Amino acid sequence: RQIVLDTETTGMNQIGAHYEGHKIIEIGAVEVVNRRLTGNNFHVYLKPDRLVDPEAFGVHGIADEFLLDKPTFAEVADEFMDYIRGAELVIHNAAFDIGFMDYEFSLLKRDIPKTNTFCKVTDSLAVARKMFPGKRNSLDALCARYEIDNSKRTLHGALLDAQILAEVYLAMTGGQLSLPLAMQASKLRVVFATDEEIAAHEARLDLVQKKGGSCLWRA
Amino acid sequence: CDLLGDELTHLTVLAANNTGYQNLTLLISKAYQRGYGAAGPIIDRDWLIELNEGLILLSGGRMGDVGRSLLRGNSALVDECVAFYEEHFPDRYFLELIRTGRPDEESYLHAAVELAEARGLPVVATNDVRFIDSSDFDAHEIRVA
Amino acid sequence: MKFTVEREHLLKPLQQVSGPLGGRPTLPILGNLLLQVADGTLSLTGTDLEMEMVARVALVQPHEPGATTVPARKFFDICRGLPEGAEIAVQLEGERMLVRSGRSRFSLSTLPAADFPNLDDWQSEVEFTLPQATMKRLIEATQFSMAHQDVRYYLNGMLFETEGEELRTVATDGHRLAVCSMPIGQSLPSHSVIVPRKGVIELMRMLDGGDNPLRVQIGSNNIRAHVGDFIFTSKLVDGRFPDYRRVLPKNPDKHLEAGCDLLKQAFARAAILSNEKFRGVRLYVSENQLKITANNPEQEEAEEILDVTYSGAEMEIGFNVSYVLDVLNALKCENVRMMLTDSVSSVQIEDAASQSAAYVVMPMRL
Amino acid sequence: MKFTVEREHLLKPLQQVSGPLGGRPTLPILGNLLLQVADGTLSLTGTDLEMEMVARVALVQPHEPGATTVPARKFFDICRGLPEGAEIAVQLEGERMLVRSGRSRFSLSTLPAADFPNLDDWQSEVEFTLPQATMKRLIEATQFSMAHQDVRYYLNGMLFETEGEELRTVATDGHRLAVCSMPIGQSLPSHSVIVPRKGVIELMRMLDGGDNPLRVQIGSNNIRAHVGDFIFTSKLVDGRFPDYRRVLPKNPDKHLEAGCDLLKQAFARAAILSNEKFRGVRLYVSENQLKITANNPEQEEAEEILDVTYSGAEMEIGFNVSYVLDVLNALKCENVRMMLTDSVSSVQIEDAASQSAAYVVMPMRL
Amino acid sequence: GLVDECWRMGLKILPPDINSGLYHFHVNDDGEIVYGIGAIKGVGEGPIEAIIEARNKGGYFRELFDLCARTDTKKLNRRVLEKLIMSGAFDRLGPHRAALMNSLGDALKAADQHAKAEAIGQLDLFGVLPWPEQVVLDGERETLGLYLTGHPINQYLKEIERYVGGVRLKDMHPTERGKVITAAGLVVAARVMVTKRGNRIGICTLDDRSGRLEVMLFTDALDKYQQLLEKDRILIVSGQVSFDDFSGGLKMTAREVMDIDEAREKYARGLAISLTDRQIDDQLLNRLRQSLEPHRSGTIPVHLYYQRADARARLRFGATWRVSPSDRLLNDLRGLIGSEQVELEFD
Amino acid sequence: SGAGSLVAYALKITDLDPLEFDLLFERFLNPERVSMPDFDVDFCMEKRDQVIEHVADMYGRDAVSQIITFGTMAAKAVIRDVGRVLGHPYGFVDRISKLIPPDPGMTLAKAFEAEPQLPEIYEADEEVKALIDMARKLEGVTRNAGKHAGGVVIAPTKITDFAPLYCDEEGKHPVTQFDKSDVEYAGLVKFDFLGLRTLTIINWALEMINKRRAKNGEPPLDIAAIPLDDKKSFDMLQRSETTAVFQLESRGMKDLIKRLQPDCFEDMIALVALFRPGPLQSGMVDNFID
DNA sequence: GGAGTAGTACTAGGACGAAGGACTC
DNA sequence: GGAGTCCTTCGTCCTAGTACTACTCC
């Protein structure tokens, strides 16, 4: 059973801990079972605990005052945990998202270990990078590649990208498997330089040495 | 050569002196004067009859006349090929032996070394070098491409 | 060189020999025939330079030996064109071949027989004859799984494998695979040879399935096949056929049995609304039911519910529909039994009455 | 909107009317069918702006009128592929057409009827009915002589010329001409009209040459044909047709008849040694005999001698053999009569036993 | 550059002519200079010689067909012939260049039949019984820009459009997808297949003197939007633009399209005409009225500028008819230039 | 500098009286200097076939050879080459290479210092990084047979007595396998292919002028026979109308001539030597004018 | 109704020409 | 240092082959 997530955040820290000083603002996740969209999506908004990043604001429009009445990670901790527990987590740049996820988990102070200890952590970007090595494997790149509309989609923010990543994910994990198949000393002659050849050799080396001031044959 | 029909083989010819130099100069000119295809201008084996003096030749190894005939296992064709060098290049024909880890090289080498002792002819090994360090290989592959 | 033959002795040979002629004979004499007249036998050659086709007609009327090379397609059409019982007279006039029939006269250019390429003699290693019938079923049953153009050029052909009393043929894409095995009635030593696809097409075409037994000889680098007086010989592409025993499903524990025709009709219809590139149909099995469905991005959808004998658990699985239709077309039979593992394994398919042929296609992840 | 009909009533109409519709036209609704339910009737439409084919079928089970337009190819393949005797239940819901039949269930994408180009109404001027069998004769005997893609846009078609109670056809590309005429037994106006190549191909296609009356109404620039509940309508093109009375040979002095199949088999054979591009042959005719000779660059020759009925002087003339082969094939008769004048002039050709048909093809200068 | 130098010097400079032109720019007695044939950009040297050669053996060329018959397609390709018309070499014969462009293909196809007719010796049945470099530049801008009197889009001239081509596009608004309208001065439309759908393929030309562009990965509607896309010798469409990482252009999807004709509606865009002082009267009630009368649509107010000696007054026609937008092209047909102003209604 | 030889002039090798204009032979052949002073006379490329013909009649076609020039792998070429092999269309790669200035000696290191967008796209684009890292490994490497001649060589025997050839698929257009510097150091004298369209122009324009002969019986025009102080000429020059005037087509050069108003032939000889970065930015131009 | 033959459609390869980066003194 | 000679590479058009589907024959 396959679980798709896309997390929109209050920007990142570019230095040190990418999660230090930051918290989660929106959770948009879709459930994908047997490569079909069930519609049992997990879409919540959270407490910012800080200012929304100017970058993040320009991406899909989110203001702090909107996420104030909305619940925190603590109110949907168990809810979201059970929703993804014992399934496939397909992520973009797993180090980033997992880092935020586990960060929030430790903030709850329920001794919560890293998600990779009880779940299969899979980045989809790494798969795309293996398929198309050294190519741009961004969502919009792959979108255009697999012929997809990302412009006439009403969902703005996480759930948009999650849906798109699901279609990309299906496209990559299509179409069709491959067939497991692939799968003494003796003599031998030494030709000693004749006296003629030796003379030519000596004269040729003389020229090298007289003109150049060196002879390694002879160095 | 007439022995392998259409098949082109790879060859090293060294000019040992100025007689050779002039013969090599004329050999190259004659290939261009003949005309050619995408492969570039080519020499006939028999042009080495006239264009002969002062030249020292390498057999070509696995990729040569004799190597390819050996790998087919046409013993008559192999004997015809070497015979040419025994006639026109006495003391001036060396069999190339190569360990670069490529297909069939050890099987060829084993059979070539047996032929070389059976004929009493002289051999030289090279590394057929195209680059400075082993890590340059990938870049040269792309250069060729 | 002179001989005289009756049109009707020439016609079936001529048609059959003209099959291999096609692919762009750059070397112009490939579009021509090799004639050798000796005894009361004119021999024919039809060739693509890798394989060769031989025909004899008996000479009842006067004959004289000699050889030349006439243009094959043109000569075939003239003969096919003449009425039944028309008298064809051959006679070489220096550098022309003259073909007469009563009062009509035609003259052919002549290139020397001596320029026609000769393939090396080789000898037989393992030897067998078999009824035409068995050869017919063998080819027909598997031809659809031939690779089209593969970089793995060894897959562009069919493995014939002998051992004891069992020959089993296999042909594949790297995606799907069809297998057929038939009794040959003689203990045979083990050999493996891959004949190139165009070769197998031609061989297929020479079989009328009739009464003359077919006798085949296989050498080190060639194959030779005699049915009566016609003889086809091809080269083999040499070896490393991957182990088909490895791909076979290892005891598929679930069985699904259904009417071949019904099933095939429903899949043909569902196929119309699947993906361009991936031919994707999605399948649901449930307690005694089969649901076929087909999707495209424009929300067009074919959907079938069917009553299917099946014991086992619910599961869904997709595949390339063209390849499965190809097998249902080759399955000219009453009942099929489909033997599964899961949504992500290849599946093996057989006639519910014979294990003689087995068909296995991989799953697609749609 | 809602209807129910029997696959069997729907299927041949579907085939005949879909036929000419482009898989991918330049205006893609042209690859959809307009479906209209009104009264007790389903109206089907395929068009290309030049022609239109309409089928009507009475609705036997409960129904509800409305309009929409569905993707033609896929829908036809779906209908063709259905099981024997299938009764399908269809209903419009929103922007999808749902098809139920047994446990098959569909929901197909839909384009609006409103977007479909409604062809033009026109006033009928001259009308007539005739046996289906006469029509089929008229068309078969003649249609293969039309041009394909001539710049003189009025030759991409056939002029029908009506005089008294006779209707006449002629079809031509400017290099060969064929005339065929039949008595229709009705006094008509006097009108000539050229209907397009593709229209005539398809009209011939649907001619179930059985009993059925065929009734036609012609306009000034459109044509209408009713056979049963199939209705064909096409626009016409205007063009000033060439005068067949200047093409009909002036005074053919010499007359020559010969048995058709023997004549034809002989032409087919001499054709093999003609230049492949221009199909050029030379005819030598003498007292009671015909000798045709040809040549190619390969230096081959064809010569045929046959006994023919000929009284007149010897004569030398060359043709494109494709042009005569095509008439000999279409003419399904016993004996022919040729009326020539000389080497440089038009010739009339006809069944020795009928007079309905006459052909002139011009000779060649090589 | 060279011509502008000539002109400043006192040098002029006849337009090309098939009949008069040699290889090089030539001096007829009075005409100091007339176009050399080799002067034409796209035409090869072989084709230029071919033209002249044919003209030498035969007389000077009578007609399109006469030209085609004497010189096969092998020498003068279709593309070659297109530029020849655009240069105005044919203007003599085919008064209407638009007419000549259309007549090329048929004559081309015709000629191939003429080649065939020759080769086979074969008999037939009977048959077949003002300025220099200112017109050419004008044509280029129709194909690569034209934007006279601003643009039909007066209410939102370049304000929406932008027409700098790749060079302007690179520095664009950052967003999900830029808002952009492209119009195409050239379109050819082809749709592919594989027996189970297939998204593609659109051909536009994109300005300024940039190149041409695809679209691009869509069309939405499905086939109604595909037809809006069509239109050769015509197109305006609106799309989303981003800088595509993949090259051969940037990416375009068509969210909306409006035609030139629709822009020419000049909604709330409309028509005003400028005419000379001397107009007959009957022109008021006759030709002027008749141009408007058959082409009516899209309530466009008619505004009239009567250039008086004394002053400019505005007389509103508003007789009844609201003009359809196709009228520009028809009006430009003879002797009268119009200007496309902001429609009065909208403001 | 062969115009310094009055003998060249006397022989019609050159076109100028060197004693009239103080032009110096010792720049061209200096007897007090011992190395060959390659006289390198050049001619119009248009008429190569006519000259190959003369020099074959003279020496033998096999004793005559063209001299090859060599293609390396410089900045714009290496970007293009690697980009294509990495599977980009031409558009992608050209949007990078058009940021590299045209400059003769360009290298990747020089490109990075001249253009700040280079560092930027390198760090922001995987494909670009992979590409330039590899272009750096291959910078300046050969690719092909040099294009035609740079000059034509004259041996006393078969050229193959001295150098190897390259020839095309028809064994035509033979070229020496050693390049211009190398081939001459190996002992054979060369003759370069002058690069001008101006003599082709003169030629064709003279044909057209001299046709104005029979139109009014005018003698043919001999460019050598013109007076050297012509006022029409100097009038038009003082009017600055010198675009399309050979050598003097630059906007800057036209600016200079306008301010300078050069009024005698000596001044016209001077113009190319004056029109340079050194003379202008050492005050000498201003001094001269003043 | 199915099989064989013909015609149409799609895809690949080669030729031709206009554009661009480069190496000559 | 400028300009021209240099070819090659990219794009466009034409030709040829191959497959599929329809039409005609058994």
Residue numbers in the entry:
A (entry chain D): 7 to 189, 208 to 243
B (entry chain A): 74 to 218
C (entry chain B), D (entry chain C): 1 to 366
E (entry chain A): 799 to 927, 943 to 1160
F (entry chain A): 364 to 653
Lines from the paper:
For processivity, PolIIIα binds to the DNA sliding clamp (β subunit). structures of the complex in both a DNA-bound and a DNA-free state to 8 Å resolution. exonuclease simultaneously binds the polymerase and clamp. conformational changes from the DNA-free to the DNA-bound state.
(A) Overview of the DNA-bound complex. The DNA has extensive contacts with PolIIIα and clamp. entire length of the 25 base pair duplex is in contact with protein. of the polymerase contact the first 9 base pairs of the DNA duplex. complex, the clamp is at a ∼80° angle from the DNA. in this complex the OB domain is ∼40 Å away from the ssDNA template. the OB domain is far away (∼40 Å) from the ssDNA overhang of the template strand. broken and a new contact between the OB domain and the clamp is forged. over the polymerase active site to a position adjacent to the sliding clamp. displacement of the globular domain of τ500.
